[PDB]
């Protein structure tokens, strides 16, 4: 199969979610060595903000920026549809995903391409995929009312067709080195049983 | 009192939430004519994305961008703390708030300035405010599991100290002109009873 890995942290080499994504990649190479792996770093290779000009590109003549945004949109969507296993690193910043991941989503959700309207409702067109979300947090939010990242990621991914999603959590990072080490260990075992299952 | 109005739509003059915000302003001038009103349009006056360079500004020597981001942060925070009634236009795009509003939040949430850590927990420092959220949506999501915007806005605002929040909804816009007119009418009556209460 082909694996797509999306990195979205702004902390580069010090990112906890990037370290876990690299672990996921190392283990998939190990266990499934015939597979291809593509990594896109949405912080090191930024997607532009969706503004009032660029929204027109996804929807007569187009401006220079509009033409670039559309070309970028078609590229991102093709890449997404060309891979089988989608890994998404989703650190929580101010109770939301990172703006780096958000901008990718805003260029990826497009009527008649990644979803469509029908009489049985709106319908996702990115089908047959398996997704794994790796979500790191400073505090402890899991299964509680301050975690809106988790259900938002299920809702958005479900909307474009990706209903098979598994979640891996690295929480309690802000409490220090030893809690961060525990988070890393626990998340890595969660990953191990996904890679082998 | 002083009213702050934050606009975040990317659709300019065709925005449903901007039309409702202008109505709110017209009626507050009408009923409370001694008050001052400040409007910031976060689409027409964009806040930059929070990246790995700018996060350093909110936290030794600082780069040129870092210095600008910090100056902008201090301005936004002072403005927020200087007003009594905070009105926030929050259109839903791809099941999230707009990136234009998000960037404002990412520059506004800052340790030791808008919140702080204590032994009774983290604690908001923007206190004594009343907030009204005007949230427009194409579909119908209210009180259901696809509305993650509403609880995310309660959580983020509560975190910086603003626990008094009222919500005004304009839903069903994508169903056409007459449903949009109904949404406008219903939201406007919601606004009328806030302005007079
Ligand atoms: C700008 C900023 C905002 C943050 N907001 C939250 C927060 O909302 N809740 C939380 O539990 N931790 C928060 N944290 C801590 C991060 O979630 C934590 O450091 C996590 O490891 C981030 O993943 P990363 O290291 O891969 O970037 C924040 C950190 C920063 C940089
Ligand atoms: C980029 C884009 C994404 C949208 N996503 C959603 C959606 O997630 N759910 C929904 O009900 N409507 C969605 N809509 C419709 C808007 O929520 C609706 O048009 C609303 O009026 C937006 O507020 P505004 O007119 O003030 O910009 C979307 C529209 C656009 C432009
Ligand atoms: O829950 C916590 O309790 C603490 C107690 C003492 C010292 C640090 C912390 C934390 O970092 C967090 C997590 C934490 C959080 O829960 O929400 C946030 C929102 C915005 C920015 C940062 C954060 C956090 O670090
Ligand atoms: O629920 C709906 O049902 C429809 C039936 C027929 C024609 C149009 C629509 C809609 O626009 C929506 C709302 C709607 C929605 O619920 O989610 C979205 C997510 C991303 C982008 C746009 C949207 C929408 O327009």
Description of the structure:
The structure is a homodimer of 197-residue chains. In chain A, α1 runs parallel beside α6 (177-196). The longest helix of chain A has 20 residues, at 177-196. In chain A, strands 2-1-3-6-7 form a 5-stranded parallel β-sheet, with helices on both faces. A two-stranded antiparallel ribbon of chain A has the order 4-5. The two termini of chain A are 15 Å apart. By secondary structure, the first copy, chain A, is of the alpha/beta class. The first copy, chain A, has helices spanning 16-31, 54-57, 64-82, 99-108, 149-160, 177-196; strands at residues 2-7, 36-41, 85-89, 115-118, 121-124, 130-136, 165-170. Chain A contains 6 helices and 7 strands. Chain A binds chain B through residues 10-12, 43, 46, 49-52, 55, 93-97, 99-100, 102-103, 105-106, 109, 145-146, 148, 151-152, 155-156, 159, and chain B through 10-12, 43, 46, 49-52, 55, 93-97, 99-100, 102-103, 105-106, 109, 145-146, 148, 151-152, 155-156, 159. The complex binds flavin mononucleotide (2 copies) and bishydroxy[2H-1-benzopyran-2-one,1,2-benzopyrone] (DTC) (2 copies). One flavin mononucleotide is lined by residues 9, 11, 15-18, 91-95, 136-139, 141, 173-174 of chain A. Chains A, B: Keywords: Flavoprotein, FMN, NAD, Oxidoreductase. Chains A, B: FMN binds at residues 9, 15-17, 92-95, 136-141.
């Amino acid at each position: 199969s082909k694996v797509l890995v999306l990195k979205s942290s702004i902390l580069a080499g010090y990112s906890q979610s990037n370290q876990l994504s690299d672990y996921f990649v190392e283990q998939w190479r190990e266990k499934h060595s015939a597979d291809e792996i593509t990594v896109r770093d949405l912080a090191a290779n930024p997607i532009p903000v969706l503004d009032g000009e660029l929204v027109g590109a996804l929807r007569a003549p187009l401006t220079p920026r509009q033409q670039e945004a559309l070309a970028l949109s078609d590229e991102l969507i093709a890449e997404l549809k060309a891979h089988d296993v989608i890994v998404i690193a989703a650190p929580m910043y101010n109770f939301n995903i990172s703006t780096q991941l958000k901008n990718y989503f805003d260029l990826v959700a497009r009527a008649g391409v990644t979803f469509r309207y029908t009489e049985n409702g709106p319908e996702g067109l990115v089908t047959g995929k398996k997704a794994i979300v790796i979500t790191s947090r400073g505090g402890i939010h899991k299964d509680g009312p301050t975690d809106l990242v988790t259900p938002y990621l299920s809702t958005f991914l479900g909307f474009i067709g990706i209903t098979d999603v598994k979640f891996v959590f690295a929480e309690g990072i802000a409490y220090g080195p030893e809690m961060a080490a525990k988070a890393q260990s626990d998340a890595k075992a969660a990953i191990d049983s996904i890679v082998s299952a």
